[PDB]
Design a protein around this ligand. Structure first.
Ligand code: 56Z
Length: 277
């Protein structure tokens, strides 16, 4: 826009490009998403009133010249970069726990307001120097499939808040192990990597699963792998919480509110991360 001076391109989505920009008038530094539907913009305009310390603030929405611009408060680094920067040593557990706890608070908040994110991934989890982490780039009603809930992969038409809990569980596992939990390269490979680790779901653990749009009786039948092998460095409270975030049945999957009460968070604190900007 004319009112903004692009500083640098900082990312892209399957619908828009995000720039670090400076308000030529106020000088405020922001994240500006450019997108090339009044019902959607109404859904967007609503996100503006979503104020929570763990949700990136949407400052303005401008529809002009066949372009939709979303102006957000700017954070200095995303979790993917932080994880890559911390790959040799690993993010300390207290910080992992703090981040998970904060993201659950953000989700408990949007979910109580009937807002789903739908596409959580390290690249849209933003951190600052003060130890906070916030949910960014909410999704509206080469793409990464690594954090996709099984019900989405199986063709469910209606998503529930449980899809965000699944994504956050995959991210939690990744911070702990320093390796993506389910790194699929195709929808079926994604689905099958999930099955190989958690076991091929059936009617016992997931009532209705065999009646899902994309379920095939011909899916291979893999046995559930021992959880202690999945995220070895994680203590039992962490593994217990993770298993509840990764339940196959959306209705059995733990809620963000309930997860916040899990014993894993008994000793949660808010450490300062070492950020190289
Ligand atoms: C995938 O699509 C997205 C669309 C929009 C947003 C968004 O709201 C952002 S991105 C941002 N700053 C930032 C992001 C990454 C880095 S990095 N890579 O660590 O050097 C540094 C700064 N601040 C806000 N508020 C995030 C993702």
């Amino acid at each position: 826009m004319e009112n903004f001076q692009k500083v640098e391109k900082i990312g892209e989505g399957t619908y828009g490009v995000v720039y670090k920009a400076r308000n030529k008038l106020t000088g405020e530094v922001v994240a500006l998403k450019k997108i090339r539907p009044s019902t959607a913009i109404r859904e967007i305009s609503l996100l503006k009133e979503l104020n929570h310390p763990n949700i990136v603030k949407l400052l303005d929405v401008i529809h002009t010249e066949n372009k939709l611009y979303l102006v957000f408060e700017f954070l200095h680094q995303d979790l993917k970069k932080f994880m890559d920067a911390s790959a040799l040593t690993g993010i300390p557990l207290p910080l992992i726990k703090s981040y998970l706890f904060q993201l659950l608070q953000g989700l408990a908040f949007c979910h109580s307001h009937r807002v789903l994110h739908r596409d959580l991934k390290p690249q849209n989890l933003l951190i600052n120097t003060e130890g906070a982490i916030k949910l960014a780039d909410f999704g509206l009603a080469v793409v990464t499939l690594w954090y996709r809930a099984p019900e989405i992969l199986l063709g469910c038409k209606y998503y529930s808040t449980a899809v965000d809990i699944w994504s956050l569980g995959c991210i939690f596992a990744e911070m702990v192990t320093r390796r993506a939990l389910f790194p699929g390269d195709s929808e079926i490979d994604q689905l099958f990597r999930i099955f190989r680790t958690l076991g091929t779901p059936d009617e016992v653990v997931w009532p209705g699963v065999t009646s899902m749009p994309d379920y095939k009786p011909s899916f291979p039948k893999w046995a559930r792998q021992d959880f202690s092998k999945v995220v070895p460095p994680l203590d039992e409270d962490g593994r217990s919480l993770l298993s509840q975030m990764l339940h196959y049945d959306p209705n059995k999957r733990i809620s963000a509110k309930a997860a916040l009460a899990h014993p894993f968070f008994q000793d949660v604190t808010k450490p300062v991360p070492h950020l190289r900007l």
